[PDB]
Write a protein that binds this ligand. Structure first.
Ligand SMILES: CC(=O)[C@H]1CC[C@H]2[C@@H]3CCC4=CC(=O)CC[C@]4(C)[C@H]3CC[C@]12C
Lengths: 332, 33
């Protein structure tokens, strides 16, 4: 099954991004929304009551028009489709002192194909290093140090990872790459390796918004939008981001002769998404009132942390990207 | 006459799976290095 939760996940994606952007004036942002969605959807498998309803709604789902089951099947079909190169996976790291409910184990296996790995969380230093090692392998070395030792303890950790390697259908010219000015703002200018290609490219000078954009494919199914807002107009353009805007852009894009200069990009985001998720309505999950009563029988759990790490390497051949989302739970 | 497009100021990257329409990656590039 292909597109059933596209609308919800992409709404969540844009929303999260907009909230992340408003909480950071001058920094690079890079996130994998699908990883966050999958991580939180899996987590909801252990939730009940107000906790459950609030989380699924914050993830973009209308619970009066689609059941919890339908949502989880959608994430299952997503996972199957992903798992030149794309991989996506889920793991559950568990303390020996925690007996999971069978139906919960059944669900994470059925819908999310989660690995279940029994660790000892009494020594957070070793546990976190082990989990980190796991994420590093699964992302082929791209995501290191997802968890700190600085972090609180945990009794249970849920992890999603994503890795993606795309090859431009239209690579940039290696002989044309050179140092050029990158204007960070009016006053700040840096030197960056700037790629060039001269070719037929999908281009649109937007008449409704202060921006130009191009669209580019990867070999296979991947595609990418590069959007250049006018000087100082970044937040205007960001506010307009929506499925509808992408649809309007997609209708406006025309094959054109373009001298296309795009810098080599190497950026990486590290987020504690707690605050942002609360701004998005997802709140009870982080409190003592959290209902995690589908996970185990006789322990009261809450979420302490939702962490996200993503890395982007962009060059003349394509894109090397990875992402990973961790949720720690401990006894309230 | 070719359109000259220079991404030498803050810009947005959006990566999608054309098949499922998933938002795979979202970037705000303020400083690419
Ligand atoms: C035809 C095409 O290039 C595809 C690639 C990515 C696709 C979009 C991905 C996001 C998306 C999610 C939706 O639920 C509505 C349609 C849209 C807005 C898609 C419209 C068609 C697009 C633009």
């Amino acid at each position: 099954h292909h597109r059933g939760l596209a609308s919800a996940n992409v709404d969540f994606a844009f929303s999260l991004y907009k909230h992340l952007v408003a909480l950071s004036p001058k920094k690079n942002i890079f996130i994998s929304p699908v990883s966050i969605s999958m991580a939180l959807a899996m987590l909801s498998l252990g939730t009940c009551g107000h906790t459950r309803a609030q989380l699924l709604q914050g993830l973009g789902f209308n619970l009066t028009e689609r059941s919890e089951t339908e949502i989880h099947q959608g994430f299952q079909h997503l996972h199957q489709l992903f798992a030149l190169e794309m991989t996506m996976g889920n793991a559950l790291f568990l303390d020996g002192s925690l007996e999971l409910l069978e139906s919960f184990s059944a669900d994470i296996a059925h819908y999310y194909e989660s690995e279940v790995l029994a660790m000892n969380f009494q020594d957070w230093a070793t546990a976190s290093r082990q989990i980190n090692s796991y994420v590093k392998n699964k992302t082929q070395g791209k995501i290191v140090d997802l968890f700190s030792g600085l972090d609180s303890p945990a009794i249970l950790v849920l992890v999603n990872y994503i890795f993606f390697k795309g090859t431009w259908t239209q690579p940039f010219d290696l002989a044309s790459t050179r140092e050029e000015n990158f204007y960070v703002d009016e006053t700040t200018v840096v030197k960056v390796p700037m790629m060039l290609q001269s070719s037929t490219i999908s281009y649109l000078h937007d008449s409704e918004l202060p921006c130009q954009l191009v669209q580019m494919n990867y070999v296979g199914n991947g595609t990418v939008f590069f959007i250049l807002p006018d000087k100082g107009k970044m937040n205007t353009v960001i506010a307009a981001l929506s499925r509808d805007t992408i649809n309007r852009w997609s209708a406006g894009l025309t094959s054109s002769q373009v001298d296309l200069y795009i810098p080599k990009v190497t950026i990486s985001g590290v987020y504690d998404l707690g605050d942002v998720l609360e701004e998005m309505g997802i709140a009870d999950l982080f409190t003592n009132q959290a209902n995690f009563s589908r996970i185990t029988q006789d322990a009261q759990l809450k979420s302490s942390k939702v962490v996200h790490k993503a890395v982007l390497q962009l060059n003349e051949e394509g894109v090397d990207t990875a992402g990973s989302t961790g949720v720690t739970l401990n006894l309230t | 006459k070719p359109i000259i497009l220079r991404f030498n100021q803050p810009f947005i990257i959006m990566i999608f799976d054309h098949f499922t329409w998933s938002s795979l990656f979202l970037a705000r590039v303020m400083n690419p290095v």
